[PDB]
Design a protein around this ligand. Structure first.
Ligand SMILES: OC[C@H]1O[C@@H](O)[C@H](O)[C@@H](O)[C@@H]1O
Ligand SMILES: OC[C@H]1O[C@@H](O)[C@H](O)[C@@H](O)[C@@H]1O
Ligand SMILES: OC[C@H]1O[C@@H](O)[C@H](O)[C@@H](O)[C@@H]1O
Lengths: 825, 841, 169
């Protein structure tokens, strides 16, 4: 018993106002007097960070959305969201800030890795599965970012200018599917504008569509700081401003607007408060099922074998095999192999930003291979591809003459009020594990005028002789000292490189075995952050040469390449679709030296493979979460048979893509020039060849399918597809994909549209039948912009059933006589 | 001159003022006698002067179509064409010319792509300016049309062009701004379409904020014909005059009732519109002594002279672009044993379809041009057919078969009746009787005291005698806007009265073609007869039109081999192909970039029999050449007007050495073009998604290769050039370029093209932008310096859409100089350090 | 609401008039005969009245707005604002109105005509029928006398001046 209307009747005006914003970054407002508790929310869509970045409680990191979507497996995505709920309860977060489902209208989007698919049906069913899995556990979902936050560049002001047809068919559509099938408890409004109006105060989006048309009854929260007005946001449907303390909705701003008849009425305030109360009721109603403790502690209690195995399956099923000539794959355990490449020993579990977290652990691909084979594995780096140098904390000690324990590994961070007599004391001390230090709450730290200083210390011991490059990045100020000798100055002259500085570096000749003193004196942000790193310097030409040489001296090479969460991050978009640095040269040399090299690529979004024609085996890993390396091993050796399909089009070159010319905010606007033609919708219409198309992925076995039954009423389509593993060696899963085409429509349309899919597991020689039933209106409508309505048009239509958007294997023609106009769900 | 605008404004009464806001008929403003304000006559169009009628109209001098004109890249020559359109206007007694057209070929498929100048806003603006200065120097007013973003024909009366302000500013508005800045045209015509939700013709932002308050232009705005859509908004918002009369939106009752009722408009709005119409009339009247124009004057063919012929021939021949010339196939010589093949060989495709077309003095077919050149008969074979619809009936019939094929017994007789044949007594006389030469009877603007302009209700009986030239099957045809019945020997063969299907005829508003194929006997006499009712006889209709036609059926299959057999047997084949004014017309857009029907099959077959074939293409806009790799000589001839055939011959035989450069990009394939997905009015709109990346701005940005790029054209000789001087102040660029004919046989003209680029701007731009060009003649081995001087602001500004103003950004820039957008020969880098924000001209 | 609309609300609620004629003037900036607020939002959506709107005579000011905003029929003929050319040109050019607006209007005219036709056997009306003085009867006379006599208001009557008696000189 938490009663929304009786509480609305009992709250005073000031309490009403106080419910319309969050208290701090993660919490709503407790109202002891009426039994209304504070609710914790937490990022993000691929696992749960909890209440802090710096010194964060470790957690279960899932694979990233585009990887998730590539499973084409609702049941699994549903399991995944169920796991995300357990991870959340472990952090005592009653509400998750995920899934994310904006749209990769082009490939360069900085958060492209974080959403699901360029296809609105796949995005919407992925979204709907994850939310259903979260909410079945009684943890609330927050679908974000509503809507058209499809690039990062200047997102707070960016105006997405988009027709009502593209808006309905591509960008609103995954939210519609999620609402219709999963009823999320919350939605987060976007930072941007749509057609001139910030989403967070758009009556069209937040009220006309979400409320009047869809009848969705959940709670809208702003993206963080993504509120832009006092009264209009309240009038126009933004239920709660995050984070607190409130900027736009103080008691004085709000009640002054009420008393002065400016814009809003008490009815507007109530309407927003009611919606907050309903989200609160969902949380309180599930407290018995979840065990959430208000302002409770955060643990690593979900860090179990059950969780590890599941994160492993999810990661392995995300992987997409893109090429496999000559049976390079699977590898045999007895193959003589070398592992090469910049991503080989990296732990690229996620993209950057709010979706990232602190992990229990991350298994590198190298380690995955080591674990697989149960012994040492030859290795060479081949080339570097980092955006900035980190790795200092990850390879440092407090006192070198003590063993590399967990208690002794890392750096000590000592916080100070002043930068001081011998006798000032640290007001906080933390063991620092990761080099990038992100800021953070303390009583000696003034909330929004936060001035403090960090003394970061430890010992670094070189494992090889030669040159080593040290680095510092600060937002604020700091100085780097090695053996109490200044080596890098980020105090005196500063250059912006997005709020903070450019990396400054110092190359130094060091000696294997010897203990050097690392001390970094940092100055608080005027809330801040910094990164002191170190990397062993290499001779790039010689290292390419070496990797080539080594590759020639082994049967097989495994080259692990790609991008990382610094190249793909909330905050900015990519400049280009290139792999970094000398990667491409590394790859050319290795392919020349051993043509039977398997290439495994980790990225959230497409990259150009210029050497593609010479690459005989190519695997798309994605960013795999905690178990990424094990999952990769599973696929390479065939303990998992690759079963993922691309959730994205993979064009040859950046210029081929439909958003090539409009993927930048210029004069504050982004024109959606391609209209409905996004992803494969674009490339099939132009008949432009791509490297790999939507829905593509190979297996180690072969499959065949046909429509084995088909029926249409005036209202419905039922289709039965027979699928069979025609191989005699591997069991495996195939993804049946159902596309619709209009054969004689008055209106321009995509060549075909995904409207169904089923994933089916088959032992060698096994045959199964999957059923796919849809209401016509789901399958064949388009949005009629002039009439302001969806339209099931009379005509002839074709269903195409296949294993990719290209690989169509069975079709059926049918007729539609019953025309229908509609709105809503 | 006596004509005093303000004085007359203070003298006019309200009734008379209202009467000045609308035309009286298709082509004439309102005479007011007590005040000596004459009726002004206006005429179509941008490539010649049609005069006051389509049907039975006075012949005239048709120029080459706009995209041909722009390909000259010759400002002086374009001024000279302007002077000549003016002389041609005077002979028609038209004081005002409804042209030039300068909408933008944002994609290649536009119905009227052929009519405007270029995808490049600079070349379009300069071409516009040049023609406007030539006409007005001679005292005839221009009317730059169609303001603005009428860039396709599909659903043009309602189509909403949705376009950013940046692209609006830099591509679409910009040729008009150039025209206004350099040539100050007396009139502009508002477009049919909407821009960003509002019909241009009642758009305060286009018609007043920009034209008046920003550009300070002071000419008169007219509607497109019927392109007015409200009574009051259009008046409040800047539309000076509604065409045609009789008025629809602007009767004495609609306007004064709006005024008396305080709805939308005041008397000030009315006066503001009238003042502008008075300014145009004063232009005309001020120029009367110089022009000789006679109010409601007669129409002559008085300018049909050798001086005109020569000038039209020079303009056409300089419009021709040479695209490919391998193996010294061109020029042809009197010696070569040639054959002439192809659907356009004997065709007279002088222009595109619609309001830009006219009745010509004559048109020299490309076959005729060649015959005139060699002074003998030349072998020919049709090759294939490529017409959209069957015409040719009036062009080959006689009133009386028994008499000789005269200029007086040739054609057909049209008889107009107030009543239809089913119903009239035999002692009812026609109210009009005309001899008919062309099979398309276009009655849009037909005028008679028996025909009511508010309801043009009337009938035509069309008669004659047809004598077949071969035995075999003949196909007869009938198309109508209104109602039509076609009789052969008094038995009905085509029925266009019952179950009319909407089709291509009459700007896309008429019926489909219906036909009847009949077996016929040589020398035998057949009585042809068409019964016809105008639009209102058969919704709300215009006067309409109709077309009766006949064609000799052939074995298409057999003519392709024949053609190849004949070409194998000749030294060289000259294959004349392309589109025509039915495929390319006001009214509707092309559906794809294909050459029609068996054209391509024909070409493949001829290029196989004989690789020494020259292909001459006539089209206003790009077509795909699938067999391009195998075609060793390719000439783009456009639609060259009266002298088109002689201009082609000139260029083919080298009496004129090719000096045209492409005014449009030529993509390999329709799918390559920027507007591939948004060149249709859908849900009443067209989204300009490519934004400023129109034409070569698009292709270069994506590094997409095209069959032939903007600015490309070959010659018979060769040239090199290099920047010889360079100097930039903080507000000007002066550049000198030396160009030398490096060949030793042919004299030739070359076009120097100047492009600009910003090197590390933070705004996105095209790679480079044409901002200057010069044309120069050079004898073999001759070298001339050409100079090019411009304001910084005009050569390197982009439109800053956030600030609503143009911006010269500080940074590094690159001038690139060359003979196409793809053949840069000389560059130089300069620094610009003081910035500039500007609005206006 | 309280003064000017009220008599109409009362008449719609109690008497359901077949027709209403729109005024000549504007209300708050908008001519009544094209005021969507008055003709649609109030009359249709709020009061659910389903009669026919005719303009006052010549009280039409636009072609497209009046059609869109709910003026069912322009009086008098011959039409000024609604010629076939004007209307169908607005429709084909997408200016202001749709065929549904035109339908909406026509529908209301059809209902008025329905009322007339359904009553033709009761009333005996004759299309373009002649005009009599057939109702000039004593029975009509007495009614108009009654109605007139009851209308009169006596404002003063000091010292029994009224009633007059025929004895009075
Ligand atoms: O980190 C909290 C929130 O902040 C904003 O930066 C992001 O756009 C959201 O996706 C995220 O949930
Ligand atoms: O014929 C007069 C006018 O009619 C319209 O159909 C065309 O759009 C104009 O370009 C032309 O000047
Ligand atoms: O005579 C027809 C109409 O004329 C208008 O001027 C009056 O206002 C109406 O009361 C009358 O019905």
């Amino acid at each position: 018993k938490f009663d929304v209307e009786q509480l609305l009747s009992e709250l005073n005006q000031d309490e009403k106002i106080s419910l319309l914003s969050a208290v701090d970054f993660w919490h709503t407002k407790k109202i002891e007097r009426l039994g209304i508790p504070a609710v914790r929310v937490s990022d993000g869509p691929n696992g749960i960070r909890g209440t802090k970045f710096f010194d964060g409680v470790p957690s279960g990191c899932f694979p990233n959305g585009t990887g998730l979507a590539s499973t084409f497996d609702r049941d699994l995505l549903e399991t995944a969201g169920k796991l995300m709920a357990k991870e959340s309860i472990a952090k005592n977060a009653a509400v998750i800030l995920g899934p994310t489902t904006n749209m990769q209208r082009g490939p360069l989007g900085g958060r492209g890795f974080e959403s699901f698919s360029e296809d609105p049906y796949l995005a919407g069913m992925a979204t709907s599965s994850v939310v259903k899995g979260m909410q079945g556990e009684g943890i609330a979902a927050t679908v974000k970012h509503f809507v058209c936050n499809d690039l990062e560049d200047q997102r707070f002001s960016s105006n997405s200018i988009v027709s009502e047809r593209a808006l309905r068919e591509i960008y609103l559509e995954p939210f519609r599917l999620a609402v219709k099938h999963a009823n999320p408890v919350c939605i987060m409004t976007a930072y941007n504008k749509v057609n001139g109006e910030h989403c967070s105060q758009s009556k069209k989006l937040l009220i006309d569509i979400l409320r009047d048309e869809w009848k969705w009854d959940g709670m809208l929260m702003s993206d963080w700081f993504g509120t832009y007005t006092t009264a209009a946001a309240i009038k126009n449907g933004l239920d709660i401003e995050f984070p607190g303390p409130t900027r736009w909705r103080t008691r004085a701003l709000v009640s002054h607007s009420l008393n002065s008849r400016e814009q809003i009425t008490t009815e507007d305030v109530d309407d927003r408060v009611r919606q907050v109360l309903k989200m609160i009721k969902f949380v309180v109603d599930n407290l018995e099922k979840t065990g959430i403790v208000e302002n409770g502690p955060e643990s690593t209690s979900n860090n179990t074998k059950e969780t590890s195995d599941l994160l492993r399956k999810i990661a392995a099923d995300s992987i997409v095999l893109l090429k496999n000539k000559n049976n390079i794959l699977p590898l045999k355990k007895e193959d003589n192999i070398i592992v090469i490449g910049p991503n080989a020993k990296a732990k690229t579990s996620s993209g950057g930003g709010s979706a990232s977290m602190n992990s229990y652990y991350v298994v590198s691909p190298y380690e995955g291979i080591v674990n697989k084979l149960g012994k040492e594995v030859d290795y060479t780096v081949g080339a570097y591809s980092h955006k900035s140098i980190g790795g200092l904390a990850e390879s440092s000690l407090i006192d070198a003459a003590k063993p590399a324990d967990a208690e002794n590994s890392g750096l000590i961070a000592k916080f100070y009020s002043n930068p001081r007599s011998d006798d000032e004391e640290p007001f906080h001390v933390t063991k620092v594990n990761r080099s990038n230090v992100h800021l953070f709450k303390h009583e000696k730290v003034d909330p929004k005028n936060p001035y403090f200083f960090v003394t970061l210390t430890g010992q670094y011991v070189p494992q090889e002789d030669g040159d080593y490059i040290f680095s510092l990045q600060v937002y604020g100020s700091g100085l780097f000292y090695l053996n109490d000798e200044l080596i890098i100055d980020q105090k005196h002259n500063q250059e912006r490189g997005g709020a903070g500085t450019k990396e400054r570096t110092k190359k130094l000749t060091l000696k294997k075995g010897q203990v050097y003193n690392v001390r970094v004196e940092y100055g608080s942000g005027p809330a801040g952050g910094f990164q002191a790193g170190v990397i062993k310097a290499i001779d790039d030409d010689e290292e390419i040469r070496n990797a080539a040489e080594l590759a020639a001296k082994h049967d097989k090479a495994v080259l692990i390449i790609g991008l990382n969460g610094e190249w793909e991050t909330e905050g900015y978009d990519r400049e280009n679709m290139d792999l970094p640095k000398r990667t491409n040269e590394l790859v050319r040399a290795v392919l020349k030296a051993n043509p039977n090299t398997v290439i495994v690529n980790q990225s959230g979004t497409p990259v150009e493979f210029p050497w593609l024609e010479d690459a005989n085996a190519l695997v798309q890993a994605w960013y795999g979460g905690n178990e990424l390396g094990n999952a990769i091993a599973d696929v390479l050796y065939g303990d998992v048979v690759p079963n993922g399909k691309l959730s994205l089009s993979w064009p040859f070159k950046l210029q081929d893509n439909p958003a090539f010319l409009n993927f930048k905010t210029e004069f504050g606007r982004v024109i959606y020039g391609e209209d409905i033609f996004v992803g494969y919708r674009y490339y099939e219409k132009l008949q432009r060849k791509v490297a790999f198309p939507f829905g593509y992925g190979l297996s180690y076995t072969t499959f065949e399918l046909d429509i084995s039954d088909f029926k249409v009423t005036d209202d419905k389509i039922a289709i039965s597809v027979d699928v069979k593993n025609t191989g005699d060696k591997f069991a495996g899963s195939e993804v049946v994909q159902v596309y619709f085409s209009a054969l004689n429509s008055k209106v321009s349309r995509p060549v075909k549209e995904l409207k169904g899919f089923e994933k089916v597991h088959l032992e060698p020689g096994e045959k199964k039948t999957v059923n796919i039933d849809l209401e016509l209106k789901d399958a064949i409508s388009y949005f009629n912009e002039e009439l302001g309505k969806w339209h099931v048009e009379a005509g002839e239509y074709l269903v195409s059933v296949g294993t990719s958007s290209d690989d169509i294997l069975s079709v059926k023609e049918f007729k539609v006589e019953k025309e229908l106009y509609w709105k809503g769900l």
